[PDB]
Structures are given as structure tokens and as C-alpha cells.
Amino acid sequence: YSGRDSLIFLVDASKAMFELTPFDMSIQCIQSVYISKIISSDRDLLAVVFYGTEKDKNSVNFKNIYVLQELDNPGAKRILELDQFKGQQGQKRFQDMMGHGSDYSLSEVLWVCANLFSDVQFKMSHKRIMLFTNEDNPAKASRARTKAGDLRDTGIFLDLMHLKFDISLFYRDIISKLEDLLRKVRAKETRKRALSRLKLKLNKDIVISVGIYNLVQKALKPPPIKLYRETNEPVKTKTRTFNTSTGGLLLPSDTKRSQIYGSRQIILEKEETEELKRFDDPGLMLMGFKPLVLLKKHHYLRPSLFVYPEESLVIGSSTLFSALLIKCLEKEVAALCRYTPRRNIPPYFVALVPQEEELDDQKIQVTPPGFQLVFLPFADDKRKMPFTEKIMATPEQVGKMKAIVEKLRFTYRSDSFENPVLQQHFRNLEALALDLMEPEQAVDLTLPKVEAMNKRLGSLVDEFKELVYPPDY
Amino acid sequence: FIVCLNKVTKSFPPLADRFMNAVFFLLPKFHGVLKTLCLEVVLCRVEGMTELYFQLKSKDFVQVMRHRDDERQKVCLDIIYKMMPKLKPVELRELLNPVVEFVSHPSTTCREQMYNILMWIHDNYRDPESETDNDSQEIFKLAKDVLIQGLIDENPGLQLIIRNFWSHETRLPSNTLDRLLALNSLYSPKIEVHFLSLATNFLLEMTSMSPDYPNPMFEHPLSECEFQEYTIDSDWVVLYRSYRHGDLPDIQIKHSSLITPLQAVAQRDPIIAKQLFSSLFSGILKEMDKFKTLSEKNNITQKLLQDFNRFLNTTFSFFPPFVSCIQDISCQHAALLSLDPAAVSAGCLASLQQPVGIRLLEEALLRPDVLRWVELAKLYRSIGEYDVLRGIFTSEIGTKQITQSALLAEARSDYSEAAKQYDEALNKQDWVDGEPTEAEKDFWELASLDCYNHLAEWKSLEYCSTASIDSENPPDLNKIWSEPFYQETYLPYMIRSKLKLLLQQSLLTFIDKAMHGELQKAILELHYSQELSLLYLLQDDVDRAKYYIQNGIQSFMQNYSSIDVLLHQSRLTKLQSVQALTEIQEFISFISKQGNLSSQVPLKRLLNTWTNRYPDAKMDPMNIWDDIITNRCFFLSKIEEKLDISSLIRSCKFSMKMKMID
Amino acid sequence: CSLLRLQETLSAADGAALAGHQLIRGLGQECVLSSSPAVLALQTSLVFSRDFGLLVFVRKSLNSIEFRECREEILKFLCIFLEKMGQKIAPYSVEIKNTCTSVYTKKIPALDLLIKLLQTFRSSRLMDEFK
DNA sequence: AATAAACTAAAAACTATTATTATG
DNA sequence: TAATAATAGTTTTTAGTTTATTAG
């Protein structure tokens, strides 16, 4: 989906930033937001265009407006522009070259904002404007309120907090908690493109699209491009199956794919090579229903994803899936599907465990109404060790470890942990922009936390040792 | 949405009064025909925008003007037309500055619309009464000039209504006298070719009010018979005289019946146009001769002399008919005999109308006088009145001897020792005349240059170009040196010197400075295009040389058409440029046959050809000797090399020397 | 002339993105202007085919998205010269093919340049077939 | 004295265009 | 005997092919 929220930094200079002075904290807010945006989305554009200025620095050059980093993909440019002014000395030098609080017409700055939002040429789902003031800064406002309402009609959102929820009295009508904006949000990729929906062969006469969009799945380090070691510019990396016995690059008419099986390399053709990958057709070929009791769940270990419908290709996606998930309550089975994302794919036996919508009070689409992919394993990959079940539970031991650990009851917030590599290197990119150290470390909480406080909660496994040797080493 | 909105705004303008923000939030987002529909909506409800010039600030009216669409551009012009009554004059000429470049476009409809804009401005906003700031005066100058160029619309109706607009007593005051005065102040620096024609048109169309001009001049036919309109076959001309015809000669034709064909031939034939203009102007002078105050007369003559300056100053082709008309008009009138001798000299020289200005200056002398004398001497040298020139430099103003001994050298044509005398004493200013006129000083400089151009001393040609001149300018010259007028005179010699030195670099510097400013390039191609052709044919960028040679052929043809042929010396000098033009053109055309280009069969048989077709200097001036020598050497050096041998080339050098001798 | 100096100004303009936009605008204007068969226009377009090198190297020939539209425009003008008003095919074809190979080296108008070269091989066989 | 593999290896995304058959 | 129509096309995140030592 093309379309995002375009945000501009329209910050007032009415010395409502200069009373810590609100300027420094506002600049920290905007820099943290830009740090989030550079590591999250370049599709969203950031405009460092402040008003209330002693200068008329803007496109139409209206009263008390300054442009620093207009609407653009986030980057270190705005980071350094705000970094040179974030400090109190930065604030005073800022007030020197930019200006102090001055008079102007709010219609002027709102017109400039309208020009900025109408000059970008991106299909943009939403538009937002942020603004900071210590208190309500205020004809001068009636035209301003009219223009702000019109911009709101154009999909532009207005954001303002008074840094005195106490004193914005003259701005209550004008207006349409920044600790979250202090980089609480950070490093979340925004892509909305993914594979075409697969065709569920639920039966032999009607097939229904299923929405499998890998758009908000795992995100990691940016693309490492083989830049030149001297000037930091990429290389083309001319690579292919090339020849030394005959020289040059082998042509497709001269390349044959084989399989070294038994005692020989079974030479086949490329056509057979890549057409062998298919057993049938693309889509979710449904065999039937498999009771959830027959899941190994010690082999449901690979990267698993969700199975959602898609009411875009067939009318009956939403209809039949709504009925199916309505009747999933009385079923202990899963939609036994074979999975081919495209043509020439080996279908995988998939059990569709019903994961219906968790519509909360606000109906947040947590676990959206559909199914979750249950792994039906095979016989080639698991690190199996020989089983040993001569050991059962003993009441003393079970009670002792229960009292040791039962206090620590978590809730398993699925996104609670932070990926080490991803956030690590993203904030490291932040530091590279800042030209500084390794900023901070990300980890999948892999350092245990209970072991330092299990005895604080009354651990008994440490207290009760089954052997003079560490009972479980 | 926007499509149906542009569809309904014409269907109902008031409905557009709820979506100004919609279009303004989308106009710098709408760029296809969406932009066109936005223009439609804006135009239909421009009154809906009290202030929308700030849209132009934000929506980039200029970039829309870059787009090519009579639709888009024209409706933008119409929007301005709606809002230029409310437009601020500063914003008005701000918007004018990108507009003026659009004149003369093949659209002729958006072109017509912007010409309506220009006339509207000159009527009520750029009008001569709203001239309170340099803003307004610049706007009015631009508008008057572009409407002057609108008098000549290929649309006869458009230029006709433009003529009506002008001739209107507001634009052009009704009285023939003050109409004439406005015409004298209305000339455009580019219309002197047809300025006289259009002025005659306006003057004669005023006579329409004369309630006898449409009447017959005769009512008493000597031979009276039936007079009915006569017919004529016109198989693939429109009548201007109906031919009320019969057995006997009528004389009861209308004054109009003659004047209208007369006006048409005047506006079509430039030479008869200027003759008629001079005659009518003189008759107007007799009209003021009745009882009019001489104070007004001398004021008119003063402003007319100023107008003549603004003509000669702002002209660069120096239209030989227009120049001659101005010269004679000055001739017949003492208060008009007050011309700058230098100005009339330059006009004659650029128009090849030397003798007309010679007669004018003769009347001026027999009427400063020293400047008049020196200008007459300059033109006498240019033509060759070296006898009267001897008389003048021995009696009138010539008290020196280096000038006179160099005069003997030039009459003996051995310019060598003439330039020796001059470069000997040209930097020193003390003389028997005390300080000789700076005209005589740059005359000595030009004589040294004419020597070192006459001789093959191109190295000393550049040397006397640079240093041997009086130290009134740095040695080398470029566009930053055109401001001194003597340097302008030297420019043909400058190209000659540099081109021959390369044939043996400030030249290319001045060439690019000549493209920098199309006036420079236009003058160079008018007067030195063949030199450019020879240069860039030697510079091996021969496509540019071919470009220059075709432009030079056209310039030669047009100049010879414009420059009077009855001045047989002027026509002969014009046709002396034939040799180099044909050289470059035919060598480029024939160079496709490159087989006989380095071999010796274009050498053994065609080297003696170097020095076979050589004239005598009496019928071929020896500057044209240098011309044709360069031409033939270029021919038979380029055709003998770069795909009998050496002794033959030396023999041809030697024979070229004897022909120089003869 | 007006065409030569205006195109030179457009090339000299080559922000880089805005420079590309104004270059494509001016080139579309000249394309809808260059529909003239006069030999003078043919000669001026010829002599400015030499300045095409600077035109495309201020375009950087880089397939850059800020000058990818200029590539479209120059190829559309080449399509204007695809028909035989470019009577003088000899003096430029070799440097033209070398330059266009450079432009493709350092999208769709690259294929358009290939089509131009194929047309030259159909018309300007002599010097092009050697290289 | 040879078993151990998470160091990436590829494909739809609505962009949008042409191309219709616009005419006897 | 002369407009509107579809390959027209993309900022393709997993084909599931590299990191990982007791076999002698």
C-alpha cells in the first residue's frame, strides 16, 4: 500500500522555547524522532522548518519562518542540524543565527505548510504537523484556525503540547507527553509489499485466496553494499558459472544441472531441473482436517508464520473464513493444507491451527482472524538424541523447584525482547551518524534475570541440592 | 473529482467557491492535464481568490510558462488578464519578465492573447499616464516594442486592429503634427526596415478623416465617357484601383483610389517608401512654415536629432534605405544639418552609403568643423578621394607631415613606410598641430593596420593591433574592448590578423564573446562570416565553417539587396567577397571526393593552378588580393594533402610574388 | 542560436534532480520545436550533436534517477532524428554509439539507443560497421 | 585423529504506460 | 480508412545450499 504519514516539524519561536528552556527539550524530541525515522522509514519525510523566527527563510518568504531541513527522507543532516543547537549553548547560538521570538501571521506559516504538503509527490496516506510551545502563544488566530481546519480537511494532522495539560488557553480552540517521542519508538521498517495471495484448494470446485504478507516480519541490518574500499562506491560483481578449461563464462546452452546420487552425477537438463520442483500447482492444496492432538510440537520449531485469508481475490474469503472461524470453536482440528507459494514448489503439509481475532476493547488486530501455521515435520533435520524416560517426577523435587520458580510468572509479550543484531546495528548506525562509540547493546534477553533474583524470591533449587556435586552440573 | 469539478465550474462558477484549498493542495501535485483543469477552475473563479499571486509564488507560474501549451499558457495569461487589474505593478513586471520571451510564437492565439495583455497594459496599467516609477516605464517600453512587432502580424486582422489601437489618439495622438511627433519617439531598434512603411501607413490612414480624400480630385474630364469597374483574370492579386473604365480617360478617380495603392506600394517597396517619406515629411515642414513659432520648430528639430541618434545608436544593420533617408532629411534642413559627423560617417560606412553622407557633410562644412573635416577625410580614404584628401591634409586641418608623407605612400600604395611613419610617431602626441585630433590618431592606427593587412605581415598586423596603437587600451581586445569605437573599426582587421596568423588565442576568446551577446555574432556574420568560415575550416571543425559560409552567403545576398547598387564602387566591393564564399562553399561541397585529396595528380597539375587566375590590382583591390590568395592557397593546399611536387610549389610561390608585384 | 545556447544553459544547469527536470522540460520544448526540415536546422542540430557529449555528461550518462528522465528525453529526440532529416549521418555516428554505450554502461532509453544504432546500421552502414 | 553447520543468496508488490480498433 | 485500453512490470524481505569437529 502506497501511502504513509508525512510529518513536518513546525516549531514555534515565540520564546516559548526559551523559558530547562523548552527549546532544548523540544530539539531532543525532534532529534529522537528523526533517529527513529532514519532507522524506521525513509518513505516518511521529515521537514525541519521552524517559524516564529527573526528571518523569513522559506519558499514564499513569509514572516518569522526558517527552513533548516525541508521535507525529505530522514538522515544525519537533520540530526547534526539539531545537534549543533540542542545544548543551551547550542540554543543560544541557534537564537543568534536563526533568531529569537518574533511576530508573524499564523496564516502565513500554515500556508507554507500547505505548500510543503502539496509540493511532495508521494501518495501519502496521512499528513501530520508537530508543534511545541511553553504556553498558548496568542484575526491573528481566526484566520489561523480557519486555515488549520482546512489543512485538517486535507488530511493534515496537527500535534501540539504546551510545556507549561495546564496552560494552552488561547490555543485550545486553535489546537485540533513527548517522552514516547524521546526515541521510545525506534527502528521499525515500513514496507507493505508482499507475495500474491495463495489459492486454498479447500475443495475441488472453489478456491479462496489466503493473505500471506511478509511485510512486518523480521527486520535486520541494512544491505551491506560492496562499496569501494577507497571512495565507498559499490561494485558490479561480475559473477556466474565461468570456464577455465575453456575460458570465459559458460552459456545457458552449455550448462547442465545434475545430481550426484548413488554412484554417479545424474546429468539432467535445467528445464527438468527447475520443473521437478512442482508436485501440483501453486496455492494451499487442502487435504482435509487434522486434529490438533496429533502435533509433535517438539518439531514445531522452525520459523513459523501466520495463515490469514485475503478478501481481495475471491468474494468468499471473508465470508467462508468468518464462518469457518465461527465454527472453529467446536473443532479440535486444523486445516490440513499443502503449501506452494508459487509454481514449481514442493508443497509442505501444513496444519492451520485456528488463531482468531483478539479484538480487544479497541479491537486491536492482535492475532488477526485466520489460522496459524502448525509444523508437520518430516524425517531429516531434527537434532534428535536418544530418548531416556526412565526418569519421572518426584514429589520432593517437584515441590522444591516449584517453590523455587513458580513465583516468576511472565506473560510472554511476543515483541518484548529486542533482536541483538538488528537494534544493535541500527543504533550503531545512529552512532556512526553521531560519529561516536558503540552506543548501546541489543540482546534477546539472553542473560537470565531470575537467577539473580530467584533466591530473592525464595529459590529452593539452590537451597536444596540433590548432590554434593552440582545436582545438574 | 477534479475532472467533474472543472466540468462543473464552467457549468456553475459558484460551486468552485468551496474547493480553493483542494486545488491549491493539489496544483503543485497535479502536473498533467490535471494542471490544465486546475487552470480552468482558477480562471473561472479567479475572483474567488482575492490573493492568488502567492499561488504563483508557490505553484511556480514560471514552470508552467516553461510548458508548451497554447491551452495551458494561454489560460494562465487570461488568468493574469483577470487579475492584472488587481495585480501590483512590482508583481506585474515581475510576471512580465518571463512573459516577454514568449512573443513571436507560432501559436498566434496564446500569442494573440498576450498581445491583448500588452495592449491592455499600454492602455490602462502600463499606459503612458501610469509611468510613475522605473517599473512602469520599463513595462511601457516592453509593451510598446512588442506591439510594434505586432503591427507586422502575419495575421492581417490582428496587425490591423493593432494599427487601429496605435493610431488611436490615446496611443498615437490624432493631430498629424503630434501624430508625427509620437512616431518620431516610437521607433523600435529593429523596425527601421519597415518603420518608414508603417509610419506612412499611419499617416495616410489619418487622411481618412479628410472629407475630400475619399472624394475625386478632378470633376472636369477632358474626355468623358462611361466609367464602370473593369475586370481582370487572376488564375492561380486583389484590386486596389477599380478601373471605372470606358472609351475616354476619366480623371474623377478618388484621392483614396490612388493613395491606397500608393500606400500599399510604399509599405511594400522600401526605397520608394523612404523617398515618399522624405517628400511627405518635407511637405509637412512647409505646412509648419505657414505661421508656426520657431521656438517649437527648434524644439522639434532638437528632439528629432535626439531621435536620429537613438536610431543610429540602436541600429546595427544600419538599413541603407533608412540610413539614406535620415541622411537626406538632415541634408535638406539646417537644424537637421547638426548631425554628429562621426555618427553619419559610421552610418554611411555600415550602409555603404558613403557618398550620400559625403554630400551631407559637404553641406555641413560649407555651412565640430574639424571633426566634420576628419570624418570627410576618413570617408575619402575609405572610397579613395586621395586627391581631395591631399588637398584637405595640406590646407584645411592637415598641418603635419607624417600624415602627408603617409598620404604619398598610400597614393603610391606603398603602405610600408606609411606605417613606418605612423608607428614611428603615433604614441607621441606632440605635433605641429599641437594635439592632433584623436580621430586623426586612430586614423594613423587604422593606417598602420591597413598596411600590415595589405602586406603579408599578419604578425605585425596583430602587433600594431595590440601595441603600436596609442596606449588608450590594453593590447588584446575582446567583447570588453568593443566599447571603444576605434576598436570596433579594428574588429574586421582583428579577425583578418588572427585568421591569417592561424593560416600562417584572443581570436577564439572574442569569438565566444561574440556568441555571448547575439548582437556581436549577428554583426560578425553580417560582415565577417566568410572569415569565420575560413577560420573554422582551418580550425578543422568544418561543420561550423559550412554553417558560417551559408550564413555568409545569405548575409551577402541580403546586404547587396539592401545596399544601393547605384553606388557602383559599393556594389563592386560587396561582390568582391564572392571569391572566399565560393571557395569555402565549393570546397566543402566537393570534399566528398577525397580520392584526389593527397595524391600528386592534384599537385603536379594543380599547383601551377595556384598562380594562374590572378587579376590586376586596378580592377581588384589588393585586400581582395590577400583574400583570393588565401582562397587559392587554401584550395590547392587542402586538395593536395590530407587524403611537380616541391619545385612546382616553389615556382608557384614565386609566381604569386610576381603577381603581387604587378 | 537560440536552440544551441538554450540547450547549453540547460546542460549547465546540471539541484541535480531539478536540473534534470528543467533539462527534460527544455528538451521536450525543443523536440516540439525541432520538427523543422530546413537545412540550417539540420546543420545546427548536427553541430550540437558534438555538444551532446557535454549534454549527456552533465547528465553524467550515469542512468541516475535524477537524470533518467533526461535519458528518456534525449532518446525521444533521437527518435525525432530516427527518420531521415539527419541527412549528415557520417560525422557523428561512431562517437555517438561510443557515447551511448558509455551511457548504458555507467535503462529503457539505453535500449532506445541500441535501436538508434540499429537504424544507423540500416542507414549509416559504412563507418558504423567498422566499429 | 574426517562430521558440522542461521553468515544473506530469490521472488509478488501497484505503480502506469500501450492500446486499442477511433472510421467510408 | 484513425481512441483508449492490459504485459504494459516492482523500492522482487526463504530457492528454503555454508561458520562447523572425533572421526581414526
Q: Tell if the CB–CB gap between A60 and B21 is shorter than 8 Å.
A: no
Domain A379-473: state its class: mainly alpha
> Which residues, at least 6 apart from A80, have a Cβ–Cβ distance to it below 8 Å?
A433
CA distance A122 to chain B (A): 9
B26: contact with A, CB 8 A cutoff: yes
B19-26: long-range contacts, CB 8 A cutoff, minimum separation 24: B20/B45, B20/B48, B20/B49, B21/A114, B21/A150, B21/A151, B21/A153, B21/A154, B22/A154, B24/A114, B24/A118, B24/B55, B24/B58, B24/B59, B25/A114, B25/A117, B25/A118, B25/A154, B26/A118, B26/B2
Q: How far is the CA of B36 from the C1' of D21 (A)?
A: 29
Chain B residues whose beta carbon lies within 8 Å of the beta carbon of residue C46: 543
The C-alpha atoms of residue B326 and residue C90 are separated, in whole angstroms, by 51
The C-alpha atoms of residue A26 and residue A131 are separated, in whole angstroms, by 9
Task: Point out which residues pair with A129 in neighbouring strands.
Answer: A8, A158
Q: Which residues of A24-49 are buried (b: 16+ CB within 10 A; e: fewer)?
A: bbbbbbbbbbbbbbbbbbebbbbbbb
Q: How many CB atoms lie within 10 A of CB A298?
A: 10
Q: Tell if the CB–CB gap between B54 and A114 is shorter than 8 Å.
A: no
Q: Tell if the CB–CB gap between A118 and B28 is shorter than 8 Å.
A: yes
CA distance C27 to chain B (A): 11
Query: Roughly what angle, to the nearest 10 degrees, separates helices C68-80 and C108-123?
Result: 20
The C-alpha atoms of residue C119 and residue C114 are separated, in whole angstroms, by 9
Domain A190-217+281-378: state its class: mainly beta
Q: What are B339's three cell numbers? A: 548631425
Q: How many CB atoms lie within 10 A of CB A178?
A: 18
**Whole-number Cα distances in Å, B356 to B269, B353, B465, B499, B565:** 20, 6, 31, 33, 13
The whole-angstrom distance between residue A317's C-alpha and the CA centroid of its chain comes to 27
Structural domain boundaries of chain A? 4-189, 190-217+281-378, 218-280, 379-473
Q: Tell if the CB–CB gap between A60 and B28 is shorter than 8 Å.
A: no
Q: How far is the CA of C80 from the C1' of D18 (A)?
A: 20
The C-alpha atoms of residue B59 and residue A119 are separated, in whole angstroms, by 8
| Phi–psi pair at A129, nearest 5 degrees | -130, 130
**Architecture of the domain made up of A4-189:** 3-Layer(aba) Sandwich (3.40)
B63: contact with A, CB 8 A cutoff: no
* Residue A421 Cβ < 7 Å to strand D: no
* Residue A2 Cβ < 7 Å to strand D: yes
For residue A147, give the chain B residue with the closest CA: B21
Q: How far is the CA of A142 from the C1' of D8 (A)?
A: 57
Chain B residues whose beta carbon lies within 8 Å of the beta carbon of residue A117: 25
How is A384-446 classified by DSSP, letter by letter?
-----------HHHHHHHHHHHTT------TT-S--HHHHHHHHHHHHHHHT-S------SS-
Facing B21 at nearest CB: one of A59, A60, A154:
A154
CB B75 within 8 A of CB B39: yes
Q: Which nucleotides of D are covered by protein (CB under 7 A)?
A: 5, 8, 11-15
The C-alpha atoms of residue B277 and residue B179 are separated, in whole angstroms, by 14
The C-alpha atoms of residue A121 and residue C108 are separated, in whole angstroms, by 23
Which nt sits closest to A342, CA to C1'?
D11
* Residue A341 Cβ < 7 Å to strand E: yes
Q: Hey, of B1, B27, B29, which one would you mutate to test binding to chain A, going by the most A CBs within 10 A of its CB?
A: B29
Residues 282-341 in A having a C-beta less than 7 A from any atom of strand D are 341
> Which residues, at least 6 apart from A158, have a Cβ–Cβ distance to it below 8 Å?
A128, A129, A131, A148, A151, A152, A175, A176
> ∠ CA(C76), CA(C77), CA(C78), 5° rounding?
90
Chain A residues whose beta carbon lies within 8 Å of the beta carbon of residue B63: none
A218-280: CATH topology is Ku70, bridge and pillars (4.10.970)
Facing A154 at nearest CB: one of B25, B27, B57:
B25
CB contacts < 8 Å between A and B, how many?
31
CB B615 within 8 A of CB B659: no
Candidates C122, C8, C21, C115; CA nearest to C68 is C21
The C-alpha atoms of residue B477 and residue B543 are separated, in whole angstroms, by 27
Chain B residues whose beta carbon lies within 8 Å of the beta carbon of residue C40: 547, 550
CB B330 within 8 A of CB B278: no
Segment holding A259, helix H or strand E: strand A258-261
Q: Which nucleotides of E are covered by protein (CB under 7 A)?
A: 11-16
Candidates A220, A276, A216, A267; CA nearest to A426 is A220
Task: Point out which residues pair with A131 in neighbouring strands.
Answer: A160
CA distance A305 to chain B (A): 40
Q: Hey, of B23, B58, B63, which one would you mutate to test binding to chain A, going by the most A CBs within 10 A of its CB?
A: B58
The C-alpha atoms of residue B4 and residue B13 are separated, in whole angstroms, by 13
Residue appearing with cell numbers 555528461: C57
**Residue A196: DSSP 8-state:** P
Which nt sits closest to A123, CA to C1'?
D15
Maximum Cα–Cα distance across chain B: 94
The C-alpha atoms of residue C46 and residue C49 are separated, in whole angstroms, by 5
Q: Which residues of B326-356 are buried (b: 16+ CB within 10 A; e: fewer)?
A: bbbbbbebeebbebbbbbbbbbbbbbbbbbb
Candidates A325, A330, A332; CA nearest to A293 is A332
Candidates B187, B435, B395; CA nearest to B308 is B187
The C-alpha atoms of residue A370 and residue A383 are separated, in whole angstroms, by 31
CA distance B378 to chain A (A): 59
CA distance C109 to chain B (A): 22
* Three-state secondary structure of B507-539: HHHHHHHHHCCHHHHHHHHHHHHHHHHHHHHHC
Q: How many CB atoms lie within 10 A of CB A472?
A: 8
- CB burial of residue A246 (10 Å; 0-12, 13-18, 19+): exposed
CA distance B547 to chain C (A): 7
Candidates C65, C58, C61, C64; CA nearest to C26 is C58
**Chain B residues within 8 angstroms (CB to CB) of chain C:** 63, 66-68, 515, 543-544, 546-547, 550
Facing B66 at nearest CB: one of C25, C32, C46:
C25
Segment holding B255, helix H or strand E: helix B255-268
Strand, coil or helix: A9: strand
